[PDB]
Structure 1
Amino acid sequence: TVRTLTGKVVSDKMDKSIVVLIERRVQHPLYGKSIRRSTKLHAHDENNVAKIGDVVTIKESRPISKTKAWTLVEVVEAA
């Protein structure tokens, strides 16, 4: 009953934090062609298990820092 997202890690330089890129495909409101839209989310990684290139899952939570509100749940595939 919690909101989860699936994405690909694009950075792990900072301490205990990962940057994951989420991708979605939506229709253009007027021209009707399906277009690709992406967003960047800062998540929380307690043990630095995540790396660059892996496909991961995150879930929403209470704030952990200024820009982090998501926590890693599981690593689906390792780079």
Structure 2
Amino acid sequence: QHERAYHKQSQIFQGRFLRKDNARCLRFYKSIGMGYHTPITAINGTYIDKKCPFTGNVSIRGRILRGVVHSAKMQRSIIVRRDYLHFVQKYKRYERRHKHVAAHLSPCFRVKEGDIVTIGECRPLSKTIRFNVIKVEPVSEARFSPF
């Protein structure tokens, strides 16, 4: 046991695994609002996550935005690249512009770089992470896309 501390989902009481082998609930699969279906990977998954969008104690309140995954190299977190056009007024022309949003990728969905994801606003969960991934729309094996 190399983990300094045990990890327990807060919603389920520890004396449920010990006995009552017959029934009860040992995992809390809360369903997110805004017409997004809690995935079965969360329903049957073994992950804990305090900041998981579905099982964990987090609420998706505020806006919901979509972006491509610039990076998946932190622990259960991704950076979503947002590509948009900003219109400069004097020149009747737009500028391609980019902003990077840090989001929490819960272990339920699987994300590889280059995939569309939906990120929903959450209570600040880190210095930079104020958004939690709700959905992943996987793209092909391999441009500027405004989502």
Q: TM-score, normalised by structure 1?
A: 0.87
Aligned-partner SS, 1:56? strand
Structure 2's unaligned 5+ residue stretches are 1-33, 35-61, 141-147
2:132: which partner in 1? 71
* Partner residue, 1:35: 95
CA-CA distance at 1:30 after TM superposition: 1.9
Provide TM-score, normalisation by structure 2.
0.50
2:115 partner letter: D
In the alignment, residue 84 of structure 2 is paired with which amino acid? Answer: R
More deviation, 2-11/38-47:
2-11
Q: Work out which of the two has the higher radius of gyration on C-alpha atoms and give 1 or 2.
A: 2
Segments ≥4 residues shifted beyond 3 Å: none
Q: Of residues 4, 19, 29 in structure 1, which corresponds to 2:79?
A: 19
Alpha-carbon distance in 1 for matches of 2:86, 2:128 = 26
Q: Output the CA distance in 2 between the equivalents of 1:28 and 1:44.
A: 33
How many correspondences in the alignment?
79
CA–CA separation in structure 2 for the residues paired with 1:32 and 1:4: 30
Question: Percent sequence identity over matched residues?
Answer: 35
After TM superposition, give the deviation of residue 10 of structure 1 in Å.
Answer: 1.3
Letter in 1 for 2:78: I
* Rounded Cα–Cα distance in structure 2 between residues aligned with 1:20 and 1:36: 16
Gaps of 5+ in 1: none
For 1:8, the equivalent position in structure 2 comes to: 68
User: Once the two structures are superposed, what CA deviation does each residue of 1:21-78 show, in whole Å capped at 9, x if it has no partner?
Assistant: 0011121132120111110010001206222111111111111111100000101224
Once residues 15 and 78 of structure 1 are traced to their aligned partners in structure 2, the CA distance between those partners, rounded to angstroms, is: 22
